[PDB]
Design a protein around this nucleic acid. Structure first.
Ligand SMILES: [K+]
Ligand SMILES: [K+]
Ligand SMILES: [K+]
Ligand SMILES: [K+]
Ligand SMILES: [K+]
Ligand SMILES: [K+]
Ligand SMILES: [K+]
Ligand SMILES: [K+]
Ligand SMILES: [K+]
Ligand SMILES: [K+]
Ligand SMILES: [Mg+2]
Ligand SMILES: [Mg+2]
Ligand SMILES: [Mg+2]
Ligand SMILES: [Mg+2]
Ligand SMILES: [Mg+2]
Ligand SMILES: [Mg+2]
Ligand SMILES: [Mg+2]
Ligand SMILES: [Mg+2]
Ligand SMILES: [Mg+2]
Ligand SMILES: [Mg+2]
Ligand SMILES: [Mg+2]
Ligand SMILES: [Mg+2]
Ligand SMILES: [Zn+2]
Lengths: 147, 174, 38, 206, 59
RNA sequence: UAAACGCUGAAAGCAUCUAAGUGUGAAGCCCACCUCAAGAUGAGAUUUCCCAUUUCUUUAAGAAAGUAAGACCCCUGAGAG
RNA sequence: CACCUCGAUGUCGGCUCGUCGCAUCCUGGGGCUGUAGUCGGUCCCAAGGGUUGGGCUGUUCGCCCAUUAAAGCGGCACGCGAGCUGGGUUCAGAACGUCGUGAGACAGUUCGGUCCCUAUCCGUCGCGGGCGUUGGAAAUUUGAGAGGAGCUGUCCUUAGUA
């Protein structure tokens, strides 16, 4: 009958959640966060429309890295110049720029397309327990059972 | 045969203050504080202290022994402290201390000046015999090792800074 | 230091140990016996 | 310490003991502190300095308003100096050549003379090809790279616009300071064409 | 449809797989198209379906 | 930090650079020095300037038409090309 | 081996331009020594930079001369001919030795012998226009990120001391 519901851009209400990363493995935090950002947690999910909710990650500095990932997990990036390879350990990233650590983890898990990049913008990561988005009235999103 | 089980007594007037971690030991020589692991249980008597592990796992055996050793070191350091005796040997080697500064002439083109931390002190009973004396065994050993590394012993003639009494194999250089 | 695949004690004083996941042989008597697996 | 000036030219000076040294004459009419930047307002500490008073018809209402705080005429050049003691500077304060003393070691920043479109030989100092023996390869930039990448690696240097770059010469010596004429004589030669802007700063390496 | 049903089931305290297993136990033949439509539009009806599924699972 | 050397220290009464804990250590890695750099669509920040006009549609983040601060056309040029 | 290419994928050496690997030639750090010292030997870490000017030969290679801290080894279509050269190797001429009765040929030498292409696209080096950056303007700026640079001798002193 062609009656399947298709969500529209702007009709879906996007809420705001706060996710505390303290002692949560980086990947598991990122996986749940990516699902929320995509909107997989809401029945109105429509693949070709953005419907996910905004995420505020706090305490990024305390994200957990199991095993020796703190010193052996290496993030590479090539400047595109000959011999232009740079590396940084996950532990160093956590200490100095934890926002980058969480963002790279979640970028890997969102789709690599226009919609995916747009959804990524909805993420906000903060090392420490306080964020500047109180005006949006975000609500706590426990993930203890989701991981 | 187990360090972790072996009890530790409290000589003289040494006292111990407990806490979730950061066990503190105070006494005539001074104070110390170490963040002991939260898995080993510590029982205290009027003069006897014992440590207990939850099980016989590899990890608990290891940590039990180490924690008892560390606690015993705190007690003994606060009681009598620790001292490393170095005997620098050379035709013209000498040492002299100005306060917490130890200056060494051990053959280099320049004298070597070393500074003790507050918890350690340098004696220099003679210009060739130095003694690093402190409360923290780790710091005492570290400073003595640094002094020795200023000019570690050489085998052919025995010159250099040594730990007093340490064996120094000597090669019969021609 | 002898860095070789096969590290074995060379005299009764040689003691086999593991440091940072590497097999090593340490002899207080003869330093020539000092070995690392690599 | 720092100041802004104009590259007047080059000459030579006889020092004591009669040694002859080449010097660059840099004039610096007293600069003026136009604005003070702080961590509280801008997040970093610096002083904005203006130089070379400008005719009013050449200025804008926004620019005139900007310099009004300092109560001076419009300035042709404006630059921020960092690594200075803000407590010692305030809007409207003047900076003169006397800030430096003879024998000071300074870094001098300028904009190198422009050469325009130049070939690889001049622009990157590459080797020519042979000029005879049947050669048909004289002033060309060499191979672009190996076959395998199916492309040219970045930074394969070729012909292009040469000069006009910001260049800093380090550890120059302040040979003399003339407060009356607002002149600083700096041993050596410094980047830039005559009448161009020059920035003197206390040598960072020192 | 499967994805939307999964989201709705999670909100009702269930996974998609557990919901479908429970529905099969309870003899419910409503297909995934109708289930997804209920999840988006008739939340109460979907919740009632989920309750019967969970009861069948418990039994 | 590498190799290497440790200090304290048990597992394993000893021993032990290691497991916990702590340190030294290279022209190398990150800084340090020089230059580019907010199309860094994540498009940042600071100072200063202009001022809330008119007409018609419409509750429109409407349309067009004079402008302000300002910029450019055009013209004389070079330290630029 | 014969899987792409015979309705064409140009072959040695040199030049121009480099870039990468590390199994490191020099420089840096270190262990063992049959390491007295000065020199070394061997092994471990290390690819940041540097790592030559000639005689002979088409040469690569190699030998030699003279230097250097060192005169590294390899990959990139034995990198690089729509970037260059064309000395060598495969055209037509001619000759020697040799083989052939012969035309000719090499199991070999020798002298001479045409190297085309106006760059559409990507890529690379520079320079503009448009729009964006959410009122319109003029300046000054932070630095996510990126590039550059990175070498080393000899002498004096310490001390003719250890
Ligand atoms: K901008
Ligand atoms: K072919
Ligand atoms: K050696
Ligand atoms: K290198
Ligand atoms: K030649
Ligand atoms: K030749
Ligand atoms: K090469
Ligand atoms: K050609
Ligand atoms: K080609
Ligand atoms: K193309
Ligand atoms: Mg063997
Ligand atoms: Mg040349
Ligand atoms: Mg490709
Ligand atoms: Mg076949
Ligand atoms: Mg073809
Ligand atoms: Mg190696
Ligand atoms: Mg000749
Ligand atoms: Mg080739
Ligand atoms: Mg080609
Ligand atoms: Mg015949
Ligand atoms: Mg033949
Ligand atoms: Mg001829
Ligand atoms: Zn042995």
């Amino acid at each position: 009958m062609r009656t399947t519901y298709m969500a529209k851009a702007g009709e879906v209400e996007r809420k705001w959640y706060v996710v505390d990363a303290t002692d949560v493995p980086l990947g598991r935090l990122s996986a749940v966060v990516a699902s929320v950002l995509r909107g997989k947690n809401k029945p109105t999910f429509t693949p070709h429309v953005d419907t996910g909710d905004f995420v505020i990650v706090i305490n990024a500095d305390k994200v957990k890295l199991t095993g020796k990932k703190a010193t052996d997990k290496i993030y590479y990036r090539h400047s595109m110049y000959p011999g232009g390879l740079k590396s940084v350990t996950a532990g160093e990233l956590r200490d100095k720029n934890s926002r980058r650590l969480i963002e790279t983890s979640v970028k890997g898990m969102l789709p690599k397309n226009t919609l995916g990049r747009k959804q990524f913008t909805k993420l906000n990561v903060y090392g420490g327990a306080e964020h500047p988005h109180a005006a949006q009235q975000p609500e706590v999103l426990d993930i203890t059972n989701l991981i | 045969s187990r360090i972790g089980n072996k009890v530790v007594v409290l000589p003289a007037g040494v006292e111990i203050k407990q806490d979730g971690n950061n066990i503190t030991v105070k006494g005539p020589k001074g104070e110390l504080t170490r963040e002991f692991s939260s898995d080993i249980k510590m029982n205290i008597e009027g003069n006897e202290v014992t440590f207990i592990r939850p099980n016989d796992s590899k990890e608990m055996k290891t940590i039990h022994g180490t924690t008892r050793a560390n606690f015993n070191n705190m007690v003994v350091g606060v009681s009598e402290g620790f001292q490393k005796a170095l005997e620098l040997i050379g035709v013209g080697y000498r040492a002299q201390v100005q306060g917490n500064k130890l200056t060494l002439n051990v053959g280099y083109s320049h004298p070597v000046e070393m500074t003790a931390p507050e918890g350690v002190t340098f004696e220099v009973p003679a210009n060739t015999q130095v003694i690093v004396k402190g409360i923290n065994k780790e710091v005492v050993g570290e400073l003595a090792a640094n002094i020795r590394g200023v000019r570690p012993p050489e085998p052919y003639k025995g010159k250099g800074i040594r730990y007093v009494g340490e064996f120094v194999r000597r090669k019969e250089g021609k | 230091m002898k860095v070789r695949p096969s590290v074995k004690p060379m005299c009764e004083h040689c003691k086999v140990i593991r440091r940072k996941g590497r097999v090593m042989v340490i002899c207080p008597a003869n330093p020539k016996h000092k070995q690392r697996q690599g | 310490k720092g100041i802004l000036g104009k590259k007047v030219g080059m000459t030579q000076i006889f020092t004591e003991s009669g040694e002859l040294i080449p010097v660059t004459v840099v004039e610096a009419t007293p600069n003026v502190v136009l604005q003070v930047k702080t961590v509280e307002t801008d997040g970093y500490e610096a002083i904005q300095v203006g130089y070379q008073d400008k005719r009013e018809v050449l200025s804008n209402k926004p620019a005139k308003g900007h310099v009004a705080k300092a109560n001076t005429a419009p300035k042709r050049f404006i630059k921020e100096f960092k690594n200075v003691e803000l407590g010692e500077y305030e809007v409207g304060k003047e900076i003169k050549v006397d800030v430096f003393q003879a024998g000071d070691v300074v870094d001098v920043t300028g904009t190198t003379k422009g050469k325009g479109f130049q070939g690889a030989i001049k622009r990157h100092g590459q080797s020519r090809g042979p000029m005879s023996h049947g050669s048909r390869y004289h002033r060309r930039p060499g191979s672009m790279g190996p076959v395998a990448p199916n492309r040219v690696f970045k930074n394969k240097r070729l012909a292009g616009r040469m000069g006009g770059d910001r260049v800093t010469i380090q550890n120059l010596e302040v040979v003399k300071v003339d407060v009356e004429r607002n002149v600083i004589l700096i041993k050596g030669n410094i980047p830039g064409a005559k009448k161009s802007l020059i920035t003197i700063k206390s040598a960072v390496k020192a | 449809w499967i994805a939307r049903i999964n989201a709705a089931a999670r909100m009702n305290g269930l996974s998609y797989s557990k919901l479908m297993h429970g529905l099969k136990l309870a003899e419910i033949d409503i297909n995934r198209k109708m289930l997804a439509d209920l999840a988006v539009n008739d939340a109460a009806a979907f919740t009632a379906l989920a309750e019967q599924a969970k009861d069948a699972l418990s039994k």
